[PDB]
Amino acid sequence: SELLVNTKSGKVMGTRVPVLSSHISAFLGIPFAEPPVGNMRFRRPEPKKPWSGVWNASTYPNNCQQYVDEQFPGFSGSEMWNPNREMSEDCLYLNIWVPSPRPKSTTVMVWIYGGGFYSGSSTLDVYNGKYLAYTEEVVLVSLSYRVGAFGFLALHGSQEAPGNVGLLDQRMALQWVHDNIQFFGGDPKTVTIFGESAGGASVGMHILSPGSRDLFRRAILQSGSPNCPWASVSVAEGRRRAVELGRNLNCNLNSDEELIHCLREKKPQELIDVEWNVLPFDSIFRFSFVPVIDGEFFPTSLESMLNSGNFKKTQILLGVNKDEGSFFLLYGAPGFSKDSESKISREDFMSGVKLSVPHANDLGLDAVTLQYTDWMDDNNGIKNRDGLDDIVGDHNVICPLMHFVNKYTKFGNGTYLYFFNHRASNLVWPEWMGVIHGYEIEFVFGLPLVKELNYTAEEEALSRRIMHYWATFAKTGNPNEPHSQESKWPLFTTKEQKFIDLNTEPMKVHQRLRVQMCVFWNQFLPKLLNAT
Amino acid sequence: SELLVNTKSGKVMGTRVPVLSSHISAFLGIPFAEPPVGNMRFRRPEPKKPWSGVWNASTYPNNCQQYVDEQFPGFSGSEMWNPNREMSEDCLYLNIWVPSPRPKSTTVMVWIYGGGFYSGSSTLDVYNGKYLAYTEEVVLVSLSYRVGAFGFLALHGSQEAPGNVGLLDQRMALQWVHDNIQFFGGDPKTVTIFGESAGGASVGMHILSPGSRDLFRRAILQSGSPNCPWASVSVAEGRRRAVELGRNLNCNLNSDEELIHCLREKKPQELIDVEWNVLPFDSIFRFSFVPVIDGEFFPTSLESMLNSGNFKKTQILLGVNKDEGSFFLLYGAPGFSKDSESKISREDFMSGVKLSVPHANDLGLDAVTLQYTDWMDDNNGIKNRDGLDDIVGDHNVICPLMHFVNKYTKFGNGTYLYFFNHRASNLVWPEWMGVIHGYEIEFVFGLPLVKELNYTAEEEALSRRIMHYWATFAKTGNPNEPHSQESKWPLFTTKEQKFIDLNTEPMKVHQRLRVQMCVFWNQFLPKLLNAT
Ligand SMILES: *[C@@H]1O[C@H](CO)[C@@H](O[C@@H]2O[C@H](CO)[C@@H](O[C@@H]3O[C@H](CO)[C@@H](O)[C@H](O[C@H]4O[C@H](CO)[C@@H](O)[C@H](O)[C@@H]4O[C@H]4O[C@H](CO)[C@@H](O)[C@H](O)[C@@H]4O)[C@@H]3O)[C@H](O)[C@H]2NC(C)=O)[C@H](O)[C@H]1NC(C)=O
Ligand SMILES: *[C@@H]1O[C@H](CO)[C@@H](O[C@@H]2O[C@H](CO)[C@@H](O[C@@H]3O[C@H](CO)[C@@H](O)[C@H](O[C@H]4O[C@H](CO)[C@@H](O)[C@H](O)[C@@H]4O)[C@@H]3O)[C@H](O)[C@H]2NC(C)=O)[C@H](O)[C@H]1NC(C)=O
Ligand SMILES: *[C@@H]1O[C@H](CO[C@@H]2O[C@@H](C)[C@@H](O)[C@@H](O)[C@@H]2O)[C@@H](O)[C@H](O)[C@H]1NC(C)=O
Ligand SMILES: CN(C)c1ccc2nc3ccc(N(C)C)cc3[s+]c2c1
Ligand SMILES: CN(C)c1ccc2nc3ccc(N(C)C)cc3[s+]c2c1
């Protein structure tokens, strides 16, 4: 039977799922590790013990324990990202969509969800892999990994809570795929890992980390890169936050063992309830428990690894959306609300700058303010709003990615860069938020092919074009068809720095993506903060 | 006789001069002080001893001793600014042009020449006051003052060389005009002082200095303001430069008396020959012997005087040219030459930035570089050239003036601001230099009315318009005619910051003259240099 596959861990039975008037196979909720519960909370994951009999892989697994956004109850724009399954610490599972009839040895794509390392689920409607698997004839995997304190509490020096264990979850799923995807018709020497935001940062982290490099062929990073200011902390800052978490829960803090034992006695929701209290600064686009620069998963600082070419050398395809910042200004920055145009005063602009660059002295804040203010028209509430939007996007996503891109391309085997700037016609978020963080994903996963979801024909065409770029890149290391009528997505090079836009209009090639702003963020501002 | 005038210092006899097919009177080379020679070198000026008989005022006086530009021998563009009379330390004279028939009590305008406080002459062709006096029916005075070490060598604490004596020369000429211009038909309660560059800075200095305020009614500043980075030094820096001058001439340096006595034994050309050796930095737009912040002429720092409203409160009319910097890049900055388009490489751009902001650390230099570089096209030699041109103009002229303007207008009785951006059709300098420092002067003095000089009809009209604005402002405190068909030159206000352009095209009102750049120069950069 086509729904029965014998793996090295045991037999799994999948389910036939309908998709655009046809069908494919799905193997949902396959375990790749032992449940990380009890004394295993905060520990590195263990490989799943093989089972006899047949694992029922007909339904989605639990989602990992996480903070649940209730800022807009009932609102699809926000709840679309929340867990849609029961939350559990028993959450280390992966999902596989397989074309029918079963391929012999085809391109594999492994999805890594985002959510700021504090949230995320493999099971979101918007991550349904059936449309991509069916349309591009690829084996689509989605993995899971622990988030929040559960995945990233870091007490460096301790083996009970070393940090980075959520990244190790990801690596174990990748190990599992590497070892077993052949039985589902996947080619394990042609695996592309891809992810958005924290998932994109995660992808770049597996490129960097020696222990992950051998488990995949190439990579796609969407609106995220490993050097993002929010995506990692030092061992000292990780340690401080873990101790602050313990302090919030009345833990004994005399030793790592005392602290960890206390944190393991707590119910998951007790940890989640105080998780946001441990940030060092009043800030936006900052998350409590994230990867840690430990000297193990990351042998040295990310920047020294990038400058010295200490990373997997392969092909990468990556890019950003036009208005990455807007989500994070809505959730915390004064003057921004969901149901107004959010025209920002000078004062709220200043407050927004302070929140956007929490690690900066007054001179730094002035520098940012100068750089993003039109002084011919400084009381224009639209310009202040959009300027803040750009600050948050440039600092947290675009400029870190452009730094990564430029560093990677010196040593890599091929870079393809995109700027996604189409606002979906059926967006429920207000116009001022623009092309929002995470809203290219639905095009990547092919949702505009479903008529019931109210996309335009032009949007269907954009989704097909993106899916085919992604899958063709996964298969060959080049998103362009060997012989096509379409104009080419050009290679990104050190010299010419070319990229394309992704939208419903005819494709255009541009150069030097937001270079003026990114020289400020990547070269001037750091040098300024280091000097004062 | 119309050419004979009795003053409080004695009788003067002038000469009839032709002007645009008519005639007016001229009283040239009238002494307003004792010759500052011998033991009087470096001293404050003494009032001229009254004379019996008739002073022959038929010819121009000597020019003050100064460095003579020989960078382009034979070239009118440069030599037009050099001394056209014999140079002498005996040079404290003023010139008066008087309408015919002699007025009873009319508007007086007193011209103060520029030249970086190291050069300048009252007698230049381009300062011939006859066209302005004749056309606008004003009594036009031009004064002189000591320049270089002779006018500004400063050993604070000493009464033999206190500094600022060139400014005191100017003040004495203004005292003389105040006391005697009535006999030439001038109204001494309606005297406007005006000047360009160091002359404009000088005008603003007489506005600030308590001892000069009462000697004039209103002021016009052209491409200069008292707070310009090149226009003053501290007492300590003045002292250091004077000692360095002595060191260059093998002087005894054990005391102020020893140093000063040595400097007085030297011929004027010996001082001039080493004058440029005492600058502290490799720089452009910096001059050796300039006014000094002494606590006497200037009671406190210029900035504290400006913030507290410690200055003459009256009407001011002032402005700048489009390409103030180009002259100073030609004379020293690598990559710039007179007979090429002077396309600048990145490396020469960097060198130019270093020379333009000599007082800046590397972070400061980076900040300037970032601010004036198009990072989409950073190897464009035209953009690098023009960017450097703007750096030099913004830093040295426009932004200091805009700071002065904004500070003055809070307390003043009326501000009128202009941006002069017409390139003369008969300019001998190359196109890349644009609208050059000092090339509005010829329009102010009415030279385009002379057919032989090869100006266009449109340029004649621009000159008449400028002369009439200047003279009407001098007369009334407002450049606009009570009832005119022309559209108004609007008042400059704190709120709206309006100004006009001056060119052959129809006049347009603009706002916030180069505000983006001047926020950088006036607020950000100083704060940056103070912090590191
Ligand atoms: C594609 O586009 C189509 C067409 O635009 C969309 O189709 C429609 O979708 C909306 C849903 O947003 C639907 O609106 C409902 O209509 C009902 C019938 O008139 C209303 O009764 C209902 O109101 C309830 O929900 C609102 C919140 O959404 C509340 O504000 C309101 O108070 C009502 O709440 C009631 O709910 C509880 C629980 O039942 C009840 O006990 C209480 O009494 C309470 O009052 C909605 O307004 C449209 O009618 C649909 N239109 C058409 C033509 O089909 C479709 O959604 C789009 N598809 C996608 C995928 O986006
Ligand atoms: C990604 O990596 C692949 C594989 O590493 C890489 O493909 C390789 O490109 C190089 C070009 O630099 C090829 O090297 C050439 O091979 C031929 C035939 O074997 C030689 O004759 C060539 O030597 C001549 O030309 C040189 C200039 O390139 C001269 O310096 C020399 O004097 C000779 O005249 C040259 O060595 C190599 O064959 C391919 N390999 C494969 C398997 O295709 C690809 O370019 C990389 N892509 C990116 C975007 O980085
Ligand atoms: C496999 O599982 C299917 C659905 O799984 C279910 O989930 C658990 C938690 C219970 O709620 C259970 O009642 C559900 O059935 C079944 O529909 C299917 O029959 C199962 N097949 C086999 C062979 O076990
Ligand atoms: C969905 N997005 C983008 C975001 C962005 C920032 C955020 N910051 C918070 C800070 C505190 C907090 N508490 C419950 C204390 C909850 C949240 S939720 C949240 C959601
Ligand atoms: C006419 N203009 C704008 C300028 C500008 C700057 C200048 N710098 C100099 C420096 C040294 C020097 N020496 C003779 C040593 C002569 C000059 S001349 C000179 C003329």
UniProtKB/Swiss-Prot annotation, chains A, B:
Top-rank lineage group of the source organism: Eukaryota
Changes after translation: An interchain disulfide bond is present in what becomes position 593 of the T isoform.
Tissue specificity statement from the Swiss-Prot or TrEMBL entry: Found in the synapses and to a lower extent in extrajunctional areas of muscle and nerve, and on erythrocyte membranes.
The protein's Enzyme Commission number: 3.1.1.7
Active site (catalytic residues): S197 (acyl-ester intermediate), E324 (charge relay system), H437 (charge relay system)
SS bonds (residue pairs): C64-C91, C251-C262, C399-C518
Subunit structure: Isoform H form is a homodimer; the asymmetric form is a disulfide-bonded oligomer composed of a collagenic subunit (Q) and a variable number of T catalytic subunits.
Name of the protein this chain belongs to: Acetylcholinesterase
